[PDB]
């Protein structure tokens, strides 16, 4: 639907603060200023790194139309685009930030109910992408945004068209990207969460990752994970892509674990850590998260 993607004028928005910058461009916290109005609406703005040609822009715009067409409570959707010399893209601002920073910031103060529910929601969002037959190619804890502590959303999918330590072996060797290679990255993403944001294969050169994987080496069991959870992660990292679980199977398996969370994650002081109440859930949703879930 063409109406799902707004073409913006440069006067409609202003960048206020950098959220971070890489080789992929700069992402700013911004304000949307509707023409004729006095309101300033917080948004996220992405400025690409290189200036692009009109023909390059058309291809960017074609993909932007697809990314604006996703409609799922656990997937972020692209909202708008501004076609200057460098292209700027607009999406909803998530004030809580990304899930990677969140688990590092709340290290050891996150209960098992949150961690397992995040795994369900990420798998639900990935299952939606598969049903829309869109391959993410860069699923990681940095690309899961926190709408509320109870509600996370996948972002940055489809943009790669390299995160070696998140990629399936077939992607490293043959640059093959499928939904099953997304399942591999999902397993690494869950490992990031269960380790509260540790770096996978920390200290190991990226050039050597393909070698250790062929020998059967995998990421180690997180201390808080029971073998039931680690076994699921290990199945995600099988060489045979068709033997890896499917996302809808991951939804079901983590859902049952989420209804008995202390049986599947061993966390010191779990019986203290705040579980979300209906009171806190109604307040969060009425305030900043009114979408259907
Ligand atoms: C994982 C790093 C991160 O995302 N940090 C933050 C994210 C915020 N909200 C938000 N909303 C929509 C889109 C993005 C976004 C998308 N891409 C590709 C990004 C790259 C770098 C930074 C943000 C990106 N982000 C946010 O709103 C206030 C703040 C942060 N930070 C950096 C707070 C610092 N602290 C959490 C460590
Ligand atoms: O860059 C992109 C992006 C750009 C082109 C094609 C796909 C892309 N994937 C994507 C999917 C959903 C979403 F919600 C945001 C993105 N993004 C990240 C972005 C966009 C605007 C502002 C900040 C960040």
Author numbering: 700 to 860, 876 to 1007
Copied sentences from the primary study:
In that population, activating mutations in the epidermal growth factor receptor (EGFR), a receptor tyrosine kinase, are a major cause of non-small cell lung cancer (NSCLC). In contrast to ATP-competitive inhibitors, these bind in a pocket adjacent to the ATP site, not the ATP binding site itself, and inhibit the kinase by stabilizing its inactive “C-helix out” conformation. The V948R mutation in the kinase C-lobe aids in crystallization of the inactive conformation of the kinase, which is required for allosteric inhibitor binding. Crystal structures of several simultaneously bound allosteric and ATP site inhibitor combinations revealed conformational changes, most notably in the phosphate-binding loop (P-loop), that may contribute to productive variations in cooperative binding.
To explore co-binding modes of different allosteric inhibitor chemotypes, we determined the structure of EGFR(T790M/V948R) in complex with osimertinib and the dibenzodiazepinone allosteric inhibitor DDC4002, which targets the same allosteric pocket as EAI04521. The structure confirmed the ability of these ligands to co-bind and revealed that the P-loop assumes a distinct conformation compared to structures with AMP−PNP+DDC4002 or osimertinib+EAI045. Here, the side chain of F723 was observed to fold underneath the P-loop and contact the indole of osimertinib, which resembles the conformation observed in wild-type EGFR in complex with osimertinib. Thus, the P-loop adopts alternative orientations in osimertinib-bound crystal structures depending on the chemotype of the allosteric inhibitor. Guided by our crystal structure of osimertinib+DDC4002, we also prepared the biotinylated dibenzodiazepinone allosteric inhibitor b-DDC (compound DDC-03-033-01) and tested it in cells expressing EGFR(L858R/T790M). This probe did not precipitate the mutant receptor with or without the addition of ATP-site inhibitors, perhaps due to the lower potency of the dibenzodiazepinone core as compared to phenylglycine inhibitors like JBJ-12521. In assays with wild-type EGFR, we also observed synergy between osimertinib and JBJ-125, but only at much higher inhibitor concentrations due to the mutant-selectivity of both of these agents. Furthermore, combination of osimertinib and the dibenzodiazepinone allosteric inhibitor EAI00221, which is closely related to DDC4002 in our crystal structure, did not reveal synergy even at concentrations of EAI002 > 10 µM.
